[PDB]
Write a protein that binds this ligand. Sequence first.
Ligand SMILES: Nc1ncnc2c1ncn2[C@@H]1O[C@H](COP(=O)(O)OP(=O)(O)OP(=O)(O)O)[C@@H](O)[C@H]1O
Ligand SMILES: [K+]
Ligand SMILES: [Mg+2]
Lengths: 96, 96, 183, 524
Amino acid sequence: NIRPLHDRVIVKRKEVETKSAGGIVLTGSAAAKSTRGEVLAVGNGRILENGEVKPLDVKVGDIVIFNDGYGVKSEKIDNEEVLIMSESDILAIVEA
Amino acid sequence: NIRPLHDRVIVKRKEVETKSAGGIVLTGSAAAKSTRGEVLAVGNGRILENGEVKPLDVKVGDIVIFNDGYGVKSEKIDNEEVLIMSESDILAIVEA
Amino acid sequence: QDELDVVEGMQFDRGYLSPYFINKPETGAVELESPFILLADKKISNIREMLPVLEAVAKAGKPLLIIAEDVEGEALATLVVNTMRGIVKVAAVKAPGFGDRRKAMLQDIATLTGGTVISEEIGMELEKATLEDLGQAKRVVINKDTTTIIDGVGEEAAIQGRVAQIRQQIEEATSDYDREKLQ
Amino acid sequence: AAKDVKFGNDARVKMLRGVNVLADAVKVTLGPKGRNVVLDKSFGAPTITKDGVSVAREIELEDKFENMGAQMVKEVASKANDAAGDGTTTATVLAQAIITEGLKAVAAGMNPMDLKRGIDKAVTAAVEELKALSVPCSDSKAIAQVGTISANSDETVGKLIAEAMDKVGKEGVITVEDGTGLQDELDVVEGMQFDRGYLSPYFINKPETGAVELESPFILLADKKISNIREMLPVLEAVAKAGKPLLIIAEDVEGEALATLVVNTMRGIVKVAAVKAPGFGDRRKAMLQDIATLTGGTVISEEIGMELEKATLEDLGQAKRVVINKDTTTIIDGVGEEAAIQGRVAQIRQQIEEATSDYDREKLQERVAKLAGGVAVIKVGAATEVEMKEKKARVEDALHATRAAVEEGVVAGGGVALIRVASKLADLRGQNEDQNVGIKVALRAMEAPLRQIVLNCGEEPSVVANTVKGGDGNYGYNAATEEYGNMIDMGILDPTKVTRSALQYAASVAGLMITTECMVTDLP
Ligand SMILES: Nc1ncnc2c1ncn2[C@@H]1O[C@H](COP(=O)(O)OP(=O)(O)OP(=O)(O)O)[C@@H](O)[C@H]1O
Ligand SMILES: [K+]
Ligand SMILES: [Mg+2]
């Protein structure tokens, strides 16, 4: 098991949409890497200037939208690709 | 449903002005991307250094003007384009 | 011996952009029965632009063909994949002719097939292109060298008006090369 | 520049003199007793040849009008070599005789256009009579006879070509190349035998031969070039689970992926090897797909859509044996569906029929021979370079004659087929007397190959021509033994395609050449 530290999240990236809205199959860069992913693990929380840890607003197992860039990192846990990013890189949580 | 986190807003961009002031049709670069858009979702609020969350001045369903750049992120929810920005990137609210 | 080779309707000297479009492997010729015809005045590299058009074609179910400056790379591969996936019978070929003539004979193809050419100058883009915008024909043949359209579904009045316009161009033309291209 | 213009009989005499120069150079080689011609080459040693097309090509005259005649009659041998590859000397002999006898009637006041029409009618009827007289040549004995006769009565060349066609079958491709020995060598290869070696020297499973042997190996076909081990890593793991060897046909395997796979090869996890893709663009894909059809697999590419990461064992091809070496690679008993193989054969044959270029068509035929049947290479063995060139030309002519024999059939050799055709066309008549005279000069010039054969033998052409015309059927003149008998029994056969093509091209150029009245050239 892997759990992150401080204000960071371990997220498994969702499967890329192979088919478009109206049944058209998209392949290649048309099947661009999905920025949505379910949360696999939530860290303890962000450390403020006073030394207090503020728990993250993201919960384990919740689908979230994440921003790719320098803040996201790639790792292989039990031969599965996961991404690591701070809660700032997490944009929003998808509900329903 | 999508709702954001921290000091950020989910905004649906308004349609580009196809017509000019005197009714001249504007196309291409003339019909540029609209900086105005209605707010679809407001986050909980900005977290300060003390650990307190200050609620955002923006409200759901209010038209606001946003600045395009690195702070805006594009996403598709129910096959509709929505932009994501921090409340700092949100410029002003259009009233009346 | 002397051989006579006659063709009818639109038949230009361009082939399919990928070998995988072939519906009839025993002849190497793609045969589209009552297909849709899209006329893109710009080259195609991405799949975003005609994605609403491709979805509308998939909803209709009829085969689809593209006449564009060049459909290549990612977009071409996407059409190929959707071709053996069977959702759409899509084939794309290079637009015939060259500058200031490719546009004219593309408009001629639009007049024959009852469609409209998608161009940046004309204003409408492929994103808002619909099934009504696309052209209509009864039969279409693709092979390595030529491309034929049989019974384009277009108005006879528009066809005759285009005939008159190009005949006026013939009469105004002075050089033999332009006049014979117009003929 | 300024032009010299000659009219009528003066221009005709000059043109006929040029034709006579070229045809007398060419026709000293006709028949088995015909001799060789030395052609001076500005680069290299002179070429000793017995084929009429090389002599015809090398003839160019100082007199411009005679040079016109030479070039026009050289077109006969050029076309006869392009179409059938044999009978260039016979075509030039026929063309010269039609021009000579045709200009006799032109000087006799008869209309040259009607003479040309009569020649065309007579030669159309002659082609019909040659087709009727032809017998199909499928047995190996007649093929050996055709190859022997076409190679200046060299029985070794004929028997070697017969054995080669027997080995590679009807769909096989046979080519002639130089050899390092003094003797003729036949090299027959089966299955896909593309000329690409291993990408690294360390793949060698059999160090005593330098050849990698793979027993029942998996085959992966990567249309794209790969430089990273990531893409076929699922495929590598799957084939390691299977344990069978793997061969990659790729555009290029280099760098990290190549190093990883050779390391895994000598670690023993996978007996893997990678080679370059055959050919270049627009031909690499088609015969890569042919390899996939032979091996029962599918090519991995971006255009087709699936990636190497998604490629599985079912995607990969299957074969029974694979041989890698320094220059080429052979695949033996590729496990593919027979019906798909024959469908691919039919598709490439349709491409051949649609092909209007000799290079593309010969590449397609080579691909057909690779996927189905075999490929034979005949190494011409000769102690010296000039003998190598002469023997290579003779074997090439024999190969073209055997190909024309299986294509169209065979007839009696030595010009007796044309003699029988002319005897059958005795009652043919044109629209007027000039056309009848043109028919008659065509029939008389049909005796020219036999007469020139007898002239090269040193005997009297007229006596032998009358003796052959007196006989019926395939009775003719053995020019090697200077005897008489059934030429089919005597083994002297000529391809019907060769004789018919020679007659047709000679007749066309000769008729258009006797129709002339004025000739306009550059002044000296
Ligand atoms: N032993 C033979 N007896 C009778 N005729 C023969 C004999 N050997 C060859 N011929 C004939 O000699 C003729 C000429 O053959 P040859 O190979 O010399 O030249 P070709 O067919 O005119 O063309 P090319 O010069 O291009 O090879 C053929 O028609 C062939 O039938
Ligand atoms: K000869
Ligand atoms: Mg010969």
